[PDB]
Amino acid sequence: VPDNPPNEIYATAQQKLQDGNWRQAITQLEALDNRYPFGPYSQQVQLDLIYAYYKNADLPLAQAAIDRFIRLNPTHPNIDYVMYMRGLTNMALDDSALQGFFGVDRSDRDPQHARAAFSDFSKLVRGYPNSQYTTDATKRLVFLKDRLAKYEYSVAEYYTERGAWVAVVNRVEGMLRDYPDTQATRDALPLMENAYRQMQMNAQAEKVAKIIAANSSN
Amino acid sequence: RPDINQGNYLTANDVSKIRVGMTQQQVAYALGTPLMSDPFGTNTWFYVFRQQPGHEGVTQQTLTLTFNSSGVLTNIDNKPALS
Amino acid sequence: RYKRQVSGDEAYLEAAPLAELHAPAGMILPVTSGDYAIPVTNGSGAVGKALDIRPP
Amino acid sequence: FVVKDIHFEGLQRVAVGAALLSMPVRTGDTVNDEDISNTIRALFATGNFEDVRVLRDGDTLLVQVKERPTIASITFSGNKSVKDDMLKQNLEASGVRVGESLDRTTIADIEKGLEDFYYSVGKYSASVKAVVTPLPRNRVDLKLVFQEGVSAEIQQINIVGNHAFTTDELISHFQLRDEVPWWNVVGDRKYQKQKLAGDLETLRSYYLDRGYARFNIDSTQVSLTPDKKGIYVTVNITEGDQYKLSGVEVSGNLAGHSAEIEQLTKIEPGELYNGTKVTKMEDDIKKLLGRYGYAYPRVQSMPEINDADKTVKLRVNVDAGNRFYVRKIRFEGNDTSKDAVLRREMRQMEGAWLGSDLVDQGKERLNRLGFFETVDTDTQRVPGSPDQVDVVYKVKERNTGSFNFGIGYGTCSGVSFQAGVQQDNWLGTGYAVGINGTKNDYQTYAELSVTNPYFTVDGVSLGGRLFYNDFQADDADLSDYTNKSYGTDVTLGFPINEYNSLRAGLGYVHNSLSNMQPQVAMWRYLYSMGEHPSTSDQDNSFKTDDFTFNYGWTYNKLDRGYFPTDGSRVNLTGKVTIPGSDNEYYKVTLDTATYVPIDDDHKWVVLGRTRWGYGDGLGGKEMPFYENFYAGGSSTVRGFQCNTIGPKAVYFSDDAVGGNAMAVASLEFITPTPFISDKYANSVRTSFFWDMGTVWDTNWDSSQYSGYPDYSDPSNIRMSAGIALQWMSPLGPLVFSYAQPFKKYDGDKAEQFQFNIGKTW
Amino acid sequence: LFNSEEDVVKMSPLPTVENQFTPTTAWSTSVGSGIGNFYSNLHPALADNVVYAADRAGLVKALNADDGKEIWSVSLAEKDGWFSKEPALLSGGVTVSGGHVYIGSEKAQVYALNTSDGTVAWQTKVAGEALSRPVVSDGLVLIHTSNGQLQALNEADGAVKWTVNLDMPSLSLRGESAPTTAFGAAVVGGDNGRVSAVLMEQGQMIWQQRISQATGSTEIDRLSDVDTTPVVVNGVVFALAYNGNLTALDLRSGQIMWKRELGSVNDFIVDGNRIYLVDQNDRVMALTIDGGVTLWTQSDLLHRLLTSPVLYNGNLVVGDSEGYLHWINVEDGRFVAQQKVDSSGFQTEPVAADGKLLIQAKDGTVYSIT
């Protein structure tokens, strides 16, 4: 990479970002970080570095730079954008493979990334509730709650299959405690009603059948 | 080949320790904490001792405690084995 | 691997809405914690494949 | 006093506000005569400024300060045994990384820290030099030119003070070595620090296992040669006299299990005191107290030595903690494996009492799954409630796919290639796929396999296979016929006692015979099948399609996987054709191998191998000849040629076709090596053997071919005796054998020397 | 594969030569298996018209003073049967005062064998490996060991008389020495920078001294910090150190009189009012008696693993690793001659006494020079 006055290098960096090619743009943004680090427009350089990291699948450097920006600038006037960027960086990290196309569902892997994304988008939608990122954020939240509840339903399935009948009660009770309004729990109450019968505790099977029958079909 | 245990633990001596009218947390002092509870509003507790090793069938000592809104014990039920 | 671009791009994914669970007469639902509550919101931003993510 | 204005000269990259809020004096406040000493101390404590030059008067606080430059690139070269990444971690731990201001002084400390890291890896004569390159806007390029020098080796591992043993025996169990020849893979001559601290416990466990109780290591010593190459290791000991175990005694909060615990700690009187018996007893009391339902049982064991009659008294003190329950198992780290895979390897079920060893059994099973690089167990506490415990298994995975390759040489297989691809997590679901291909002198075998090791959740496994097989019999010293076959197998398998494994499956096969030379025993079966060609020329063909049914049993109780010394292995494989095909036969084969020791250290073993086989056709159709039995050559009875005992073919000679009844009984005697030094004499197995074999036909008739030797009489037992060696070389497994046929019959071959280099093919 | 990866550190080739002399190997007698590739101090010894050697397998020869034939040969191994032969590991010094040589070992033994027909007089056990030079002082064989136990044995019985316990670090660069006698005062090099001086009779430590500078984190400066061999001149004693200071100590006090920052693990010689030593980097210099100002600093043999100097006929003779003696003069330091001797090398001390030089090789071969 050659050296110039920095305005022309920022100009060709924006030119490389404009055409959709990213692998060259990250080098020029790093050159802006190196040759003139504390220049008068390093904020747009850092935010475009975040955008290039996200659009070119370089997720750990994206996490490092986004925690660096949340350390250095606590009250930037566009902190909602970098909050939304950390939210998308968490949620796009959840797939990280090619399994969505071949035909296998991914709702059985590590669920900690969706939990971190929920912890981000909660602060986003409850901190800056009149920004230009909220309406997509609530949709990502309502997808992520269902994706999180499918994990607990799909471990209660396995413990029904194994025969650890106290564990399915102690998991479906947690599912009814924490996600009381999703789609997975209304498909998980037959597991609890079948699980209470194999312990001969018939004083609660009528209760679970009442809470199923008072609802609709699905 | 499997081996599974399920539920709380009893000793067939701790069941001779609780009294009709025992205050709160003293059944938690002797029997230990409950592992599965009834969450739907009625303040009561369960105790299961399920174990089935080595293709021998199941066995169980299902114990049921029903409490008061205050915290004093009200009623017990000690099933020795499943029907 | 290099198939991270599918979720790396703005590929839209939508699912079913949430319905509050009913309650039969004679009992009560378990008390909810509230760690995963979704507040009511207004306004209309863009949705997937229509939202700019270029910083200003 | 106040200063009117502060002049700063030379601040370019750092901010004026940064320099003003760094030091406690600001632009024009109440000041003192400390600002000279402050500007000495403040700009030299942040690590950003080379030099200061100050002056103070009634008008201007005038400072000239240049800035320390910022690193642009930390580059390395010449790092042979070390890579750049952990060098970067050593630099970031040393204090200087990217985005830091150097001071042009501490580069000697960085070279010293690189010297300490090279001492930690085991290279002593290293020398590194830092190269500084200037660049404008206060930048430095940093280069580290290396000269690593020479690695270290261990000359001798000497032990002084031992009387009742020998110094060339205790080195055989050592992790370290001193000599390694050019025909063994016993280890390496490299030295490491913690290997010594792990090996002193191996020496202590050797001495605490044969009746020595007052044994006490005094001092260890590690010296090195003045040319910085050789390392001399010397450890002192002080051997005590032998001892015996007199009586035991228990005490503690035993939870009403005196008669329960007394039947375990009781042994017979008057035995040699051990170090494995006491620890196995301790762990057994731990396991029994866990199996009743206790969570964390503590058990201590102290001896008291009575040297007046060479006895010892063993006190054991139990301690039963209060019980614990598992409320939530949780897996954090599995990036691509399904959660239903990692929960069938947990012998602690959620919602039960906490077994302190069952978590460790789950950790060992997760290690044995082979998909994972490392696992990490832990234990937390749910707040508020005193006796509810979570358990977290963190995992870090591995690139699951592979690429294996192998060569081998034999005396009746020629060269042999084994190649293929094997994948053990197909998309991370538990399945295992593989494409395999083997080639030797005669048999070419190309198979594809797809298996699921958990059909249900109780260990039942299912597998499927598609296989192609080329058999050119003229290379394998038989009467010539060319057999090309292909088929599919679908099998089950499920364990029944964690030792005995059962299996059952179906299979379709298609066989094509051509280029088949005429004879009598093939053509009787060809008459019985009906399709009779003419006897004249070598041009013929036959096709067949079979539906099959396979069943099998496997008993495998051996004390090791390599060089066993105790136990048995019995395999039983049976095949029946089901009605719906051309051929109607059934075959049963049996393999028993028994290892029995007679000594105490398990170094004088008697080995037995029996190998039995029967088969026959049904309904009048004779059993086909391409499933015949062959016995002889490097596997059953050493000394003869490959596959050459039994009846002989009649052209219309002295060649073999096999038969349909096989009995082989071999007796081996394992002895220690008599010539090699005892430092590594446990990696070469020497044996003598006496072998019997017989293969005989049943459906032969003697009345119609009475000018020929009878083949329906299993009386011509072939006997042999020989000497075999077996070890591991850098080329792979090696087995050598020299036999001598001393009871053979008319029409057999002799091959006195016989060996197998590499893989078994 | 291992050659192309592991790099060569440093070397220097053979210099040229203008002979002025012809060294002729007169003896040329082998002893057996040889000391092998193990660093030790196993050098031959001269006694009354007789030479003695060793083998590090258990063999000890006995030869002439001018011919080179045996006069008695004794093995010291412990043979049990036709299928085994356990080595005895003779790796001490070789010395003789009272008609019976003393040979150290590695199995904590000190054999004592007579002159005429070699048999064992006594045999006892010390606290560890005994790799040092045995040395006599009014009787009282004074063995230094590798556990810091300066043990003392008597003459006709082989009994431990007293024992002084020194200190020891983790890493040592062959911590061993040889005691030196001065009026019943034994000065002894230690193992961690401490020169000691005890009484001969019962073992009272009179004083100690530290003469090696330590400026490391116990793994650079004390990566190795060991002294090798003191020697005594009138009043003042001199001692070396590895990576440290050549100093000079008074006998009663041990005060640091004058230093030179140097380093060695080999012997030296204090004949006349000069001192001739050998650096770690084989820079054979020559210093004054008290000043320490360098007289000459001829160093062409850098990183060649020299052994020791001697004083054969007004000339220093050093060893090498390639079997070459490198005869030098004294007043200038320039070379005199060179001589091919063996294709094995030397790690043992050349021994020059009674107008005779002789040297063992690394293969168990004894040579003498003119």
Residue numbers in the entry:
A (entry chain D): 27 to 244
B (entry chain E): 29 to 111
C (entry chain C): 30 to 85
D (entry chain A): 24 to 675, 702 to 810
E (entry chain B): 22 to 391
Task: Please give the exact wording used by the authors of the publication that reports this structure.
By contrast, the BAM-LL variant, (BamA E435C/S665C)19 is expected to lock eL1 to eL6, and stabilise a lateral-closed conformation. The BAM-LL and BAM-P5L variants were made in a BAM construct in which the two Cys of BamA that naturally form a disulfide bond (C690 and C700), are replaced with Ser (Cys-free BAM). To understand the molecular basis of inhibition, we determined the structure of BAM-LL in DDM detergent micelles using cryoEM. We predicted, based on the lethality of this mutation and the crystal/cryoEM structures of BAM in its different conformational states, that the formation of a disulfide bond between C435 and C665 would trap BAM in a lateral-closed state. However, 3D classification of cryoEM data of this construct revealed two distinct, approximately equally populated, structures. The first structure (at 4.1 Å resolution) is similar to the crystal structure of intact BAM in the lateral-closed conformation, with pairing of β1 and β16 and displacement of POTRA-5 from beneath the barrel. In contrast to WT BAM8, density was poorly resolved for much of eL6 probably as a result of higher mobility due to the removal of the natural disulfide bond between C690 and C700. We do not believe this to be a major issue since removal of the eL6 disulfide bond did not affect activity in in vitro-folding assays. Overall, these data suggest that the LL disulfide biases the conformational ensemble toward a lateral-closed conformation, but cannot completely pull the conformational equilibrium over to that state, consistent with BAM adopting only the lateral-open state in DDM detergent. Despite the apparent incompatibility of BAM-LL’s disulfide bond and a lateral-open conformation, both open-like and closed structures are present in approximately equal populations in solution.
